[PDB]
Design a binder for these strands. Structure first.
Ligand SMILES: [Zn+2]
Lengths: 49, 49, 96, 48, 347, 169, 48, 169, 216
DNA sequence: CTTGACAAAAGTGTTAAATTGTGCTATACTGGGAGCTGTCACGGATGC
DNA sequence: GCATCCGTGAGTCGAGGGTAATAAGCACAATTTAACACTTTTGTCAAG
RNA sequence: UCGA
């Protein structure tokens, strides 16, 4: 339940990442980020009731 | 008596509790396997039983 | 709490109880001398250390804080005496 | 995998996401060094 | 429920966009107005911005512009009206450049308003900063104004470019000047950005977060563990005292913070006792030396007195005062070891 | 020095707030990230609210209780007990005068009850949505002459003041 | 909160139902509501 | 003159004659209509409040905004090298920010639209400092749900300065 | 048993769910219904009126019974304000006290009436102004019993026409929030609301109550 | 208590090295966005 | 007048455990601050 | 989230 919303925040982390830089060659390595997921998981286990 | 620059911040066992020591955990920054929070040199954790 | 090594809180209903007994200086002390009063707890401590009777407090502190807080809302709150004349509770501090 | 629709540029490179806390044998996670636990929840099931 | 954002959205929605024609016409009318001001500066022998603002005073409202700049900026009847009267003395060729000027001035406003629909769309990808929607968009429009005044249509470039470059800046500056509660100057923000950037990169690669060794290694020359750790320490922002606690919604943060900047009730009687017992133990010294001691340590005027000064009013030489306070000091040292009253206060 | 038996609460005029204020805080800063000292015009500024250390002036030219209350010539702080930073208030002068939200959103809205405007319309006005008439000066809309306290809209205002036009393609 | 465009009701109201992301009806919900309504359902959405 | 915003309300309020409205509402109360007498009463009550208090209604639209002393809204570092601060500081900060930017683009002669919008933002910021969440979605620190506690937020409430730091201690 | 919620329903002077109609004047009771709706007329010599009642609700009165003001026609609880405007303040106090003590004694808790009585007096301590006469008061204005009492007292000596008024009963909340001291209501609740009107009127606390002194 | 000779502490002026503030980038970019439910009683302003 | 919407509450002290996260960047003027060369006092010593 |  948290994994999906975090992965959605990352899903839009991909969007604005696609519309800039160099549309020709960008490996998925540059298209993927830690934060919108890892923070979403870190927010859960620590602060969830 | 000159009061030197450095003074005593030492952690003393809080009142209402005390006893022997079964263990001591020493973690100083720059040591292997341990990453200490930025701007902080040492952390010491005593087990009082 | 025990952690901060502080004293107990006097509840609103404890206050009510003290009012019910009609103990004036007990409740007065609870609200001033031993709680938030600036020179209250100090002069008291000195009085006990010197073997005297603790004098009567003046300013609650947090009441004054309440006053200035109100002033932040542009509420003009003045303490009159018996004649409707202003009395400084801030003891010549912010007078300007 | 990164797949270009029109360009037909197919570039597949495995990436990294992050760290996901695992569970012990007794079913207790360890967060910040002090092991914690997740209680079950209850709400009326979906549907009509 | 009266959304502040829909207000602005529909407010900019009232004024339509501008095609090539309208845009070029606008810019040309503007530059024409400004150069008109340039000639009008030679007319009455005045400055550019002077007459330029005097025009505004007659256009974007009359009394209101000079009424609330704040308590003092420029006088309305004095340094303004006389500029109106002084430029009224001029013939056709001159007096017409005035109308040209004000016309260009209006054209500037129309230009800014027409392209506002861009600036709004610029600050939407810029959300999540230390500032909200309108707060960001406005500080972007501030960049739109400068994007206007510096724009040249003669280069045949669509204004949507030159404007966007100034908005993209104005916002990224607006964050540097607001952001965290504590003020962080630009360069610091920059270096921080570079650091986090590197972090994001080598963490994407290595499959885990770096160390101050490797992250400063990838940062180039002069970058060591201690520095990246330092700037990382400065990076964090203060924590609100209204921070909740655990399961309890009632428990706050700041109620856990003690006041050590005010004397504790014990410390009052402490300093009192010291200042008293010291005065008692002081009376066993010669009328001179006892005074000299408290004159030296500042128990009198609250300030240290050099041997020269202590000897100046006593007529004695500095050396004398020195020997005096030494001797007196040890003569105190005799009684103190006996009474053991002041042997306390050892911290 | 006097018994206080009475406490009055009233409205504070802008002049009164000016009187309370030791200065206008302009710079929206707290403290420099290095010095950790109150910024020039910052919300913590010593030059107005008073010194952090008792009797110790900001710059450090005046220190002890000897000279007291006299403002220094460098930083401009006053030499006095550090307690003043508790009781000393500032002010912020607004370019466009704003309203205290209490009287606006109070259940029996005081402005709305006085000026006789519903909270619904007063909301539109105070928050910059719809205009309100001040001395129409012979102005008339839709055959019915417009009067003070009446609300207008975006188009209607510039239509009365700047005129009604029609643009055709 | 915005002018009633025809594509604006197409890209908005579609999400509240047909979008499997912003609308996800639990497997238990889909299944139970499927058997309790005496009918059947394809995805986890309200409409296709 | 259609002028809109809190400034206008300040104008009308400043022009008010309380005595005239007093007598007019007195004669308005004498009306036999069961409705009219009531509303006339309730309005005359506020009018009389202002008359008896001796306070001017135009003060409700505020120019100079009072600022709470540093020790009342403290910022201090705890053990471990952290920093802690009050939300009121951030509120004030955003307020004065919007205010200064306002003055800047105002005296600059920027287009009326942006100016007006900025005025609105100033109003809602002032409100955020006075009573936060009283209108619209409450202002929260970026990333966090928790609303910023303002003056009114501190005064009123279960944990408010009265029920917490006054009526018990 | 109605229990604590009843006690609160009383102390707050709230409208009963079971609320029973009472005769506004002293008439004779005349029961009239064709079978649609139950109607009960109560008619004095020159006056008259009827009460619309559901057929289901059981009444306490018989056709041809001479009754008085405030006397209940139907079974169940009675709206405090209704009998305040029907019989008078005395009967009100009596009813309130007797009902609170009813619940308490029913639960097996013994207490002296004085306690309840003080609160009860605190409830109706406010009055509504009607035809202020020679006084600065306005129609519909609300003020304490003692205040208007003294106003009339002095008005008589001045020869001026006194102030006619009506007793006004209210719950402990609406009572306490209406108190002379602004610090009291500010401490209580509705703070944001209280301080507004307080500051507007510029009201000035004499520190008469003990709680507003507890603040001080 | 004094007189002269001196090390160290503390001063004062100019400068090297950082830190901080400001400006501009011209292909063309022209209206955001996230939603969240299983209260409850009451009192007043507002709308039919 | 009669349905609806907004606003305000709702128990008392404790016990703990506490803190996450930034994708613009570069060139240069403006100060500020650390560096440093040398001056004037200040403190200390020896002998009177 | 437990103690009374
Ligand atoms: Zn100074």
């Amino acid at each position: 339940d948290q994994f999906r919303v975090g992965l959605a925040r990352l899903a839009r982390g991909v969007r604005e990442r696609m519309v800039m830089g160099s549309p020709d060659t960008l490996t998925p390595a540059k298209l993927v980020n830690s934060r919108p997921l890892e923070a979403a998981l870190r927010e859960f286990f620590s602060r969830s009731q | 008596e000159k009061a030197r620059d450095v003074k005593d911040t030492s952690l003393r066992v809080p009142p209402g509790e005390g006893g022997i020591v079964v263990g001591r955990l020493r973690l100083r920054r720059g040591d292997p396997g341990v990453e200490l929070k930025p701007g902080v040199r040492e952390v010491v954790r005593v087990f009082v039983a | 709490g025990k952690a901060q090594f502080g004293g107990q809180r006097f509840g609103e209903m404890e206050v009510w109880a003290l009012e019910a007994y009609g103990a004036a200086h007990t409740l007065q002390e609870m609200l001033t001398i031993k709680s938030d009063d600036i020179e209250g707890r100090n002069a008291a401590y000195q009085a006990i250390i010197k073997g005297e009777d603790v004098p009567e407090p003046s300013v609650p502190e947090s009441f004054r804080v309440l006053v200035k807080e109100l002033q932040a809302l542009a509420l003009d709150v003045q303490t009159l005496d018996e004649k409707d004349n202003p009395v400084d509770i801030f003891e010549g501090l912010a007078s300007k | 995998q990164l797949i270009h629709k029109d360009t037909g540029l197919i570039k597949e490179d495995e990436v990294f996401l992050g760290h996901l806390p695992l569970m012990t044998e007794d079913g207790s996670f360890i967060i910040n060094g002090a092991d914690r636990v997740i209680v079950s929840q209850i709400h009326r099931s979906p549907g009509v | 429920t009266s959304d502040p954002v829909r207000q602005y959205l529909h407010e900019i929605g009232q004024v339509p966009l501008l095609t090539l024609e309208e845009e070029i016409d606008l810019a040309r009318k503007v530059e024409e107005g400004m150069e008109a001001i340039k000639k009008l500066s030679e007319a009455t022998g005045l400055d550019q911005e002077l007459i330029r603002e005097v025009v505004r005073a007659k256009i974007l409202g009359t009394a209101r512009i000079q009424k609330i700049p704040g308590l003092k900026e420029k006088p309305d009847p004095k340094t303004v009206e006389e500029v109106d009267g002084k430029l009224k003395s001029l013939p056709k060729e001159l007096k017409r450049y005035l109308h040209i000027a004000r016309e260009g001035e209006a054209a500037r406003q129309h230009l800014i308003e027409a392209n506002l629909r861009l600036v709004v769309s610029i600050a939407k990808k810029y959300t999540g900063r230390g500032l909200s929607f309108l707060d960001l968009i406005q500080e972007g429009n501030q960049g739109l104004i400068r994007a206007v005044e510096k724009f040249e249509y003669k280069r045949r470039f669509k204004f949507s470019t030159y404007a966007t470059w100034w908005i993209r800046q104005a916002i990224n500056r607006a964050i540097a000047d607001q952001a965290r509660t504590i003020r962080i100057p630009v360069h610091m923000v920059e270096t921080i950005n570079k650091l986090s950037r590197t972090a994001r990169q080598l963490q994407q690669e290595l499959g885990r977060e770096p160390s101050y060794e490797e992250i400063a290694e990838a940062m180039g020359p002069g970058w060591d563990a201690k520095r990246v750790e330092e700037t990382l320490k400065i990076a964090q922002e203060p924590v609100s005292l209204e921070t909740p606690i655990g399961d309890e919604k009632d428990s706050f943060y700041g109620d856990f913070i003690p006041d050590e900047n005010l004397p504790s009730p014990v410390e009052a009687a402490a300093q009192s006792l010291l200042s008293e017992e010291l005065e008692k133990a002081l009376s066993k010294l010669s009328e001179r030396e006892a005074m000299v001691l408290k004159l030296r340590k500042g128990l009198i005027d609250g300030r240290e007195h050099t041997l020269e000064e202590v000897g100046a009013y006593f007529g004695v030489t500095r050396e004398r005062i020195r020997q005096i306070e030494n001797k007196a000091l040890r003569k105190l040292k005799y009684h103190e070891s006996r009474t053991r009253k002041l042997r306390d206060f050892l911290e | 020095k006097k018994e206080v038996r009475k406490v009055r609460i009233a409205l504070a005029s802008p002049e009164k707030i000016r009187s309370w204020s030791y200065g206008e805080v302009e710079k929206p800063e707290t403290i420099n990230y290095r010095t950790l000292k109150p910024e020039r015009d910052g919300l913590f500024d010593e030059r107005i609210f008073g010194p952090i250390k008792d009797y110790e002036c900001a710059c450090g030219k005046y220190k002890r209780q000897r000279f007291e209350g006299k403002v220094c010539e460098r930083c401009g702080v006053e030499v006095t007990r550090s307690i003043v930073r508790r009781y000393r208030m500032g002010h912020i002068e607004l370019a466009t005068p704003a309203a205290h939200i209490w009287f606006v959103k109070d259940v029996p809205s005081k402005i709305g009850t006085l000026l006789d405007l519903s909270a619904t319309e007063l909301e539109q006005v105070l928050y910059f949505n719809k205009y309100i008439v001040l001395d129409p000066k012979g102005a008339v809309l839709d055959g019915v002459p417009v009067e003070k306290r009446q609300l207008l809209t975006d188009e209607e205002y510039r239509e009365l003041r700047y005129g009604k036009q029609e643009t055709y393609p | 909160g915005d002018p009633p465009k025809k594509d604006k009701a197409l890209a908005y109201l579609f999400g509240l139902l047909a979008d499997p992301k912003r609308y996800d009806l639990g497997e238990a919900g889909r299944y139970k509501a499927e058997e309790k309504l005496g009918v059947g359902l394809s995805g986890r959405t309200l409409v296709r | 003159d259609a002028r809109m915003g809190a400034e206008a309300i300040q104008e009308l309020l400043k022009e008010l004659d309380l005595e005239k409205l007093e007598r007019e509402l007195l004669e308005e109360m004498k009306h036999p209509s069961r409705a009219r007498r009531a509303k006339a009463r309730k309005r005359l009550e506020v009018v009389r409040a202002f008359l008896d208090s001796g306070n001017r209604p135009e003060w409700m639209i505020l120019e100079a905004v009072p600022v709470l002393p540093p020790d009342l809204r403290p910022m201090v570092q705890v053990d471990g090298g952290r920093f802690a601060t009050s939300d009121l500081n951030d509120l004030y900060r955003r307020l004065i920010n919007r205010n200064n930017r306002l003055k800047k683009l105002l005296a600059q002669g920027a287009p009326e639209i942006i100016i007006r919008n900025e005025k609105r933002m100033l109003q809602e910021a002032v409100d955020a400092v006075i009573d936060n969440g009283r209108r619209g979605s409450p202002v929260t620190n970026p990333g966090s749900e928790r609303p910023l506690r303002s003056l009114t937020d501190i005064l009123s409430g279960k944990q408010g300065r009265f029920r917490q730091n006054l009526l018990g201690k | 048993t109605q229990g604590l919620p009843r006690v609160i329903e009383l102390f707050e002077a709230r409208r009963p769910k079971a609320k029973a109609v009472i005769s506004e004047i002293d008439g004779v009771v005349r029961i009239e219904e064709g079978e649609d709706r139950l109607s009960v007329f109560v008619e004095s010599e020159g006056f008259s009126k009827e009460y619309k009642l559901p057929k289901d609700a059981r009444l306490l009165v018989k056709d041809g019974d001479y009754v008085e003001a405030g006397q209940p026609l139907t079974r169940g609880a009675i709206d405090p304000h209704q009998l305040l405007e029907a019989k008078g303040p005395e009967a009100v106090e009596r009813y309130l006290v007797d009902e609170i003590q009813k619940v308490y004694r029913a639960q097996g808790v013994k207490l002296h009436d004085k306690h309840i009585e003080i609160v009860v007096r605190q409830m109706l301590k406010y009055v509504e102004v009607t035809d202020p006469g020679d006084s600065r008061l306005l129609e519909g204005q609300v003020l304490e019993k003692w205040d208007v009492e003294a106003l009339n007292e002095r008005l008589i000596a001045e020869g001026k026409v006194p102030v006619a008024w009506k007793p006004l009963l209210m719950g402990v909340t609406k009572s306490a929030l209406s108190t002379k001291s602004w610090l009291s209501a500010a401490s209580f609740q509705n703070t944001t609301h209280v301080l507004t009107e307080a500051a507007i009127a510029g009201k000035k606390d004499e520190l008469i109550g003990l709680k507003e002194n507890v603040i001080l």
